[PDB]
Amino acid sequence: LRAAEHPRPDYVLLHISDTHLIGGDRRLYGAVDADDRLGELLEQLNQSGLRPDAIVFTGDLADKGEPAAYRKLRGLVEPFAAQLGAELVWVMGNHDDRAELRKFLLDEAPSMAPLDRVCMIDGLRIIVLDTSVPGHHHGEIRASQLGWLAEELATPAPDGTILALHHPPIPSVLDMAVTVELRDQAALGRVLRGTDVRAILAGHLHYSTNATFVGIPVSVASATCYTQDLTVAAGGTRGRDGAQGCNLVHVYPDTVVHSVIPLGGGETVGTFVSPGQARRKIAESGIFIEPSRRD
Amino acid sequence: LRAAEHPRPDYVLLHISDTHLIGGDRRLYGAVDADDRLGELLEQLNQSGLRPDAIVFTGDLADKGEPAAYRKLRGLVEPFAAQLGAELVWVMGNHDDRAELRKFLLDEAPSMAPLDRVCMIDGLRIIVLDTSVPGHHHGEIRASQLGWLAEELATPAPDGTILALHHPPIPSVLDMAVTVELRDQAALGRVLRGTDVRAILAGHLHYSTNATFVGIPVSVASATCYTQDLTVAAGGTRGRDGAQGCNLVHVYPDTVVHSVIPLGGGETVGTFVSPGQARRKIAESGIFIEPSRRD
Ligand SMILES: Nc1ncnc2c1ncn2[C@@H]1O[C@H](COP(=O)(O)O)[C@@H](O)[C@H]1O
Numbered sequence: 001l002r003a004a005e006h007p008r009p010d011y012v013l014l015h016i017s018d019t020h021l022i023g024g025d026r027r028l029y030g031a032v033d034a035d036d037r038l039g040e041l042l043e044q045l046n047q048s049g050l051r052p053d054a055i056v057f058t059g060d061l062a063d064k065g066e067p068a069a070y071r072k073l074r075g076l077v078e079p080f081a082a083q084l085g086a087e088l089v090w091v092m093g094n095h096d097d098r099a100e101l102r103k104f105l106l107d108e109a110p111s112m113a114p115l116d117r118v119c120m121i122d123g124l125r126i127i128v129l130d131t132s133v134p135g136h137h138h139g140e141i142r143a144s145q146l147g148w149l150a151e152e153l154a155t156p157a158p159d160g161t162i163l164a165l166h167h168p169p170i171p172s173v174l175d176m177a178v179t180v181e182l183r184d185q186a187a188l189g190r191v192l193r194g195t196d197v198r199a200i201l202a203g204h205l206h207y208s209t210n211a212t213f214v215g216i217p218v219s220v221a222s223a224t225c226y227t228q229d230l231t232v233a234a235g236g237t238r239g240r241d242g243a244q245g246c247n248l249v250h251v252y253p254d255t256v257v258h259s260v261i262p263l264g265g266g267e268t269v270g271t272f273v274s275p276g277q278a279r280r281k282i283a284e285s286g287i288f289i290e291p292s293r294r295d
Numbered sequence: 296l297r298a299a300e301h302p303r304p305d306y307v308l309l310h311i312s313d314t315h316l317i318g319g320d321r322r323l324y325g326a327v328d329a330d331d332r333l334g335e336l337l338e339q340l341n342q343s344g345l346r347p348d349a350i351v352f353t354g355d356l357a358d359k360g361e362p363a364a365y366r367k368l369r370g371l372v373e374p375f376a377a378q379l380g381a382e383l384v385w386v387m388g389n390h391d392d393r394a395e396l397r398k399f400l401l402d403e404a405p406s407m408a409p410l411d412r413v414c415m416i417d418g419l420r421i422i423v424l425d426t427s428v429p430g431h432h433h434g435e436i437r438a439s440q441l442g443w444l445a446e447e448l449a450t451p452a453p454d455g456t457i458l459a460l461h462h463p464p465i466p467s468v469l470d471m472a473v474t475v476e477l478r479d480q481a482a483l484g485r486v487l488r489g490t491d492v493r494a495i496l497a498g499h500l501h502y503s504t505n506a507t508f509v510g511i512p513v514s515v516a517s518a519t520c521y522t523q524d525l526t527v528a529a530g531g532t533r534g535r536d537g538a539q540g541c542n543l544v545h546v547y548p549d550t551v552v553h554s555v556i557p558l559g560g561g562e563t564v565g566t567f568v569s570p571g572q573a574r575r576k577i578a579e580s581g582i583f584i585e586p587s588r589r590d
């Protein structure tokens with residue numbers, strides 16, 4: 001048997017974004033049941049047997065920062081995370097309310113301070129940054145937050161660092177996005193350049209997109225509720241009930257892979273290969289996959 | 296008015312992959328009309344008003360390398376490219392036949408030599424590499440191809456280089472992919488490291504995914520015909536008639552952005568903003584977008 005080109009990943013994370021839940025049972029913007037769309041995705045991820053180390057939600061958790069929306073989100077997601085054996089990482093978006101999020105999602109005293117946090121998953125550092133501006137929809141990072149971030153990044157983590165935030169430091173293909181983009185990205189760039197940040201996870205755009213920022217890969221997950229139609233007349237914008245999903249993040253020794261998970265379904269094309277059949281076929285092709293260092 | 300954080304892009308490319316057309320009118324694998332799926336996408340891209348510099352197809356153009364499939368593909372795509380004012384870049388995949396592709400897609404003498412090519416779009420270099428192995432489905436790059444590639448990359452291009460190939464030098468989240476992955480990626484890595492390659496465009500996986508390879512961003516476009524369901528039981532694989540589309544590539548002065556374009560459609564959620572309305576709203580927000588250097 002010959003080894004495959006890459007080993008199993010060191011870490012696996014789910015990257016979900018822009019859930020936009022509202023209080024009670026009404027359709028988001030009268031057009032899409034955001035609870036249903038998120039619920040369907042979670043159930044599909046659960047049934048797949050995926051066992052991620054962490055689940056990161058990159059902002060716009062509650063469409064109007066409603067306590068009832070946070071309570072509902074927590075009720076859907078906590079049992080999901082527990083069933084998967086995964087740590088849960090929450091991030092502020094422009095639609096969220098810092099105080100209500102703290103109270104109802106985190107069981108923490110209400111505060112209007114930026115939701116900036118750090119944690120470790122074994123040797124992998126996760127930094128949560130709050131790009132939200134209360135009462136506003138564009139992104140900003142205060143001088144104080146940049147100082148805090150620089151101080152945290154003064155030393156590297158063994159498996160490097162994932163930075164999770166809402167407003168991505170990248171260009172958008174949609175013109176309207178500039179009205180509410182992250183401002184003064186140069187200042188963030190000066191802080192991040194040359195640090196151990198291996199991935200920047202973001203949302204806000206409601207489509208799947210990726211780029212680099214000061215040499216660091218940025219990955220924007222699409223939304224669970226509704227997504228931008230990128231076949232819209234050039235210059236315009238149209239959200240639609242379609243193409244929802246999330247992302248999967250695989251951290252390898254030498255690279256980070258981001259993959260788009262659309263909602264499951266659609267009629268089968270080609271041959272379905274069961275996990276057992278796949279194991280047999282791989283062996284029969286004379287290949288084995290080297291186990292994870294964290295196996 | 297204040298300038299947006301990023302200018303208009305220097306270059307725009309469409310990145311399409313894995314069309315898998317067959318001769319005649321039958322459904323691909325008896326399950327999906329690949330002509331219809333590709334046709335719908337092309338018509339949507341056409342109607343959007345997008346004007347890309349180039350359209351790059353990263354392999355598996357014809358499902359069984361059929362002359363009739365190449366003739367049909369050319370008949371669909373050439374008028375599309377001409378209407379958009381875009382250059383057309385074709386790439387070999389494992390399903391393609393080098394000789395039939397040359398004859399029927401390129402009007403070139405049949406040859407079984409690797410389809411390795413280079414061209415310029417103004418100051419942007421595009422290198423096409425052939426990772427296919429005749430009679431086989433895994434990827435390989437011959438020593439001779441690596442030597443050719445190193446020699447080409449000995450000097451940089453003004454806007455850097457896009458490398459287009461089929462089998463991506465990245466891990467897959469699907470176990471079965473290892474049986475047909477690109478072999479000996481280390482050898483390619485030694486050639487590419489420290490060169491002006493700004494993006495590696497790839498296909499083969501039939502899902503949207505991205506990573507880095509020796510510090511270079513790799514972007515894998517999903518397929519136009521059928522795509523992998525990433526909610527499949529862990530370890531398994533299931534292709535499905537759903538989530539088809541292509542990618543859009545925006546080359547900026549300082550970064551390259553890849554964006555996923557799913558098939559258009561779905562009911563509108565939120566407010567539709569026309570291009571004219573967007574221009575008005577952006578101005579009213581006190582912002583302008585700096586024009587492209589190639590405007
Ligand atoms: N009228 C609008 N104003 C600002 N952003 C919009 C508008 N319509 C659509 N968008 C898009 O929606 C994204 C912000 O979504 P959200 O923060 O959920 O409201 C932006 O990045 C834009 O691409």
Ligand SMILES: Nc1ncnc2c1ncn2[C@@H]1O[C@H](COP(=O)(O)O)[C@@H](O)[C@H]1O
Nearest residue numbers: 273355389469471472474475499500532
């Ligand atoms: N039996 C199989 N053998 C190899 N690859 C498979 C199989 N079933 C699904 N695939 C997937 O299909 C991709 C190759 O597609 P293609 O080159 O179009 O045949 C691989 O990267 C795998 O992820």
Ligand SMILES: [Fe+3]
Nearest residue numbers: 018060204206
């Ligand atoms: Fe949002």
Ligand SMILES: [Fe+3]
Nearest residue numbers: 313355499501
């Ligand atoms: Fe293919």
Ligand SMILES: [Mn+2]
Nearest residue numbers: 060093094204
């Ligand atoms: Mn947002």
Ligand SMILES: [Mn+2]
Nearest residue numbers: 355388389499
């Ligand atoms: Mn292929």
